[PDB]
Amino acid sequence: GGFVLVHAGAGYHSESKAKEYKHVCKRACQKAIEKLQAGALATDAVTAALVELEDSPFTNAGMGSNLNLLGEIECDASIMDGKSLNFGAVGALSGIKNPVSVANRLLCEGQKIPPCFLVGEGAYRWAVDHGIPSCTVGAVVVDHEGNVAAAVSSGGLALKHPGRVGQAALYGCGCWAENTGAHNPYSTAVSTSGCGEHLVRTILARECSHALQAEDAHQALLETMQNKFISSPASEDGVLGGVIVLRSCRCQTLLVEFLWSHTTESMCVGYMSAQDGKAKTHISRLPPGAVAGQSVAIEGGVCRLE
Amino acid sequence: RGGFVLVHAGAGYHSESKAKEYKHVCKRACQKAIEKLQAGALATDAVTAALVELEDSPFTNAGMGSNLNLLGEIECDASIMDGKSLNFGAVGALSGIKNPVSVANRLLCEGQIPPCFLVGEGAYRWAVDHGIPSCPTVGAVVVDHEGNVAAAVSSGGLALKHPGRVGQAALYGCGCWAENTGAHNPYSTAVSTSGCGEHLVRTILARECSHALQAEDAHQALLETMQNKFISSGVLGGVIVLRSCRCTLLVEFLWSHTTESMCVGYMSAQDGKAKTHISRLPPGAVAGQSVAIEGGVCRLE
Numbered sequence: 001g002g003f004v005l006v007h008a009g010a011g012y013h014s015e016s017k018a019k020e021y022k023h024v025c026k027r028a029c030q031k032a033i034e035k036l037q038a039g040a041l042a043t044d045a046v047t048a049a050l051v052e053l054e055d056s057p058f059t060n061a062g063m064g065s066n067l068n069l070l071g072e073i074e075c076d077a078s079i080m081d082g083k084s085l086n087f088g089a090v091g092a093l094s095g096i097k098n099p100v101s102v103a104n105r106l107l108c109e110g111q112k113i114p115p116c117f118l119v120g121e122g123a124y125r126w127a128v129d130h131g132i133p134s135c136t137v138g139a140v141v142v143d144h145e146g147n148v149a150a151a152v153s154s155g156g157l158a159l160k161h162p163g164r165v166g167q168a169a170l171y172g173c174g175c176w177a178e179n180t181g182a183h184n185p186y187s188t189a190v191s192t193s194g195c196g197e198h199l200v201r202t203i204l205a206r207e208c209s210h211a212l213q214a215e216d217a218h219q220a221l222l223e224t225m226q227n228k229f230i231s232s233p234a235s236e237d238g239v240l241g242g243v244i245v246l247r248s249c250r251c252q253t254l255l256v257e258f259l260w261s262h263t264t265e266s267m268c269v270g271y272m273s274a275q276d277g278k279a280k281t282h283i284s285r286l287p288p289g290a291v292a293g294q295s296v297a298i299e300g301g302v303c304r305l306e
Numbered sequence: 307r308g309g310f311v312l313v314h315a316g317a318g319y320h321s322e323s324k325a326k327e328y329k330h331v332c333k334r335a336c337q338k339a340i341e342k343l344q345a346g347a348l349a350t351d352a353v354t355a356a357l358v359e360l361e362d363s364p365f366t367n368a369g370m371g372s373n374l375n376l377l378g379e380i381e382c383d384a385s386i387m388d389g390k391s392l393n394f395g396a397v398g399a400l401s402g403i404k405n406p407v408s409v410a411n412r413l414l415c416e417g418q419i420p421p422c423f424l425v426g427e428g429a430y431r432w433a434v435d436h437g438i439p440s441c442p443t444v445g446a447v448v449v450d451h452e453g454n455v456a457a458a459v460s461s462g463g464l465a466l467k468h469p470g471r472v473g474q475a476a477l478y479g480c481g482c483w484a485e486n487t488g489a490h491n492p493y494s495t496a497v498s499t500s501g502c503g504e505h506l507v508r509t510i511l512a513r514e515c516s517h518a519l520q521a522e523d524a525h526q527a528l529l530e531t532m533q534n535k536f537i538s539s540g541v542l543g544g545v546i547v548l549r550s551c552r553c554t555l556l557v558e559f560l561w562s563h564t565t566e567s568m569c570v571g572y573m574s575a576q577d578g579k580a581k582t583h584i585s586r587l588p589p590g591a592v593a594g595q596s597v598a599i600e601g602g603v604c605r606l607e
């Protein structure tokens with residue numbers, strides 16, 4: 001049993017490539033559901049989804065990331081585990097194929113006070129000393145027991161200054177994962193996506209997880225997005241971004257609400273239950289007559305598991 | 307032209323030998339901050355002046371004299387936040403630079419306003435390229451006479467840390483936070499943290515304190531945050547805190563720590579004497595499982 005939601009980016013519409021994003025989201029979901037169905041951890045299954053999305057040449061992450069001011073690729077990534085609340089993250093990482101891998105390994109290292117956030121050359125050498133190959137996308141996962149994990153990985157802004165680290169590397173901002181707890185009736189997972197130099201100035205992922213502790217998830221996430229992306233930005237333009245989201249609870253059955261929302265003119269997502277094994281994709285668009293920056297698209301389904 | 311400042315030079319084990327040194331940097335840091343507020347400067351410029359002085363002390367784990375990493379190099383984290391704009395600058399794993407807080411303050415000003423965080427060599431190249439002098443946890447909070455707030459934090463991190471390891475003093479929400487009054491905040495709040503270790507980052511401590519301090523009783527808000535969110539998921543560290551609101555301007559300040567002890571300094575623009583204090587846990591409380599908290603109030607125009 002298990003479930004996985006992924007996204008391959010929230011930005012400008014590209015019918016040109018819109019069907020390439022659908023294909024990679026599919027393979028990312030399948031990779032994650034195999035991992036789960038083989039009994040691997042949630043953080044492992046989420047890392048599988050992300051390796052696959054990063055490897056797409058069309059995703060601003062891993063291979064294909066935007067080049068910085070120096071015509072180089074510098075990556076950010078982060079992952080977080082719901083059961084342990086442990087976290088792994090890399091910033092400004094160069095010459096590593098799959099950043100999310102460094103971030104995951106940093107997390108498993110921490111689960112055995114180890115480092116949890118490494119950047120630049122420090123991050124690069126650590127990564128090689130731990131056996132990881134040389135030379136924005138996101139996933140959230142729940143396993144058949146209610147354990148959630150989340151992850152995110154970006155190439156950041158095009159022509160960004162060298163060493164410039166953005167939301168995907170930062171605790172609470174790029175992704176978040178938090179199992180049912182005394183104050184969380186729901187296990188929740190969030191992965192976000194930012195766009196343009198204009199970016200939310202909150203702990204977005206963490207905010208969305210707290211918001212999703214209300215009773216009506218759909219309304220709960222829609223109000224967050226309205227506040228953080230549109231509303232809060234006195235004299236600034238709308239914030240371009242996406243977010244994916246899932247919350248779960250036990251009632252021997254797992255209830256899993258799942259959602260995506262975005263102010264960009266579109267965003268391609270991908271989901272799949274282990275029970276059915278049917279991998280669904282869907283390119284979400286903004287409704288016409290709605291310009292990006294002040295409209296919020298939002299969509300979701302639910303899913304019962306064993 | 308007026309205001310108030312609160313700084314700290316560390317939260318750690320007690321040292322009677324070093325104790326008087328720590329008291330004197332806090333004293334100088336407040337004096338550097340308050341002079342800039344008499345001279346019309348902005349809050350961010352005042353809190354940076356405080357941090358440059360704390361940094362320079364050889365005895366603080368920040369700036370010159372920071373702990374050495376696993377390769378015996380110095381790699382510094384620092385950040386700064388302005389409460390009126392909510393702008394934010396930060397450096398991590400920064401080397402070759404004398405005052406890391408100066409870089410982080412620069413990244414704000416050069417703005418125009420979009421948040422910004424540079425690490426490692428690229429942070430060095432940015433800094434050298436923008437005039438900051440290349441070199442051979444402390445923090446500060448401040449409010450000015452109109453109630454604008456700002457905060458900063460600079461640290462050299464955990465001794466022998468892996469290179470590129472970045473800690474709480476670089477991380478948005480964790481090391482410092484500053485926010486003027488609005489529709490969410492009846493209060494202008496400013497927070498800076500101390501300590502190292504991961505439990506600062508894992509708890510978004512600075513921003514959480516600011517959020518708690520919108521409640522009515524500041525002492526209770528802080529004490530709730532230190533117990534219910536620090537000591538509960540040993541946890542070592544501290545914060546300084548200040549909060550203003552109009553009556554003319556009332557500013558409540560407090561510090562708190564789970565470490566053995568913590569050196570602070572405060573000062574008003576009206577009053578010319580910098581007060582200084584070593585805050586120690588009571589006999590027979592073990593550090594990391596216990597909390598101390600004190601503070602005062604101050605009235606401005």
Ligand SMILES: */C=C\S(=O)(=O)N1CCN(Cc2ccc(OC(F)(F)F)c(F)c2)[C@@H](COCc2c[nH]nn2)C1
Nearest residue numbers: 315316317318320321328365367443501502568569
């Ligand atoms: C990772 C821990 S730390 O960086 O925050 N740390 C604790 C603070 N020390 C400075 C300090 C210690 C104690 C007090 O209170 C007291 F009154 F007792 F003095 C302070 F105000 C300040 C840091 C010192 O350790 C490293 C160092 C010392 N000199 N240069 N670097 C460490």
Ligand SMILES: C=CS(=O)(=O)N1CCN(Cc2ccc(OC(F)(F)F)c(F)c2)[C@@H](COCc2c[nH]nn2)C1
Nearest residue numbers: 008009011013014018057058059064136195266268
């Ligand atoms: C901080 C930068 S970004 O994350 O905001 N960003 C936005 C997202 N696109 C990818 C993307 C676009 C549209 C999508 O949906 C659809 F509806 F199909 F159009 C979608 F799913 C993914 C990134 C493109 O980057 C250029 C590139 C190409 N190859 N490699 N890089 C950049």
Ligand code: NA
Nearest residue numbers: 059061063064
């Ligand atoms: Na890619």
Ligand code: NA
Nearest residue numbers: 361363366370
């Ligand atoms: Na120092």
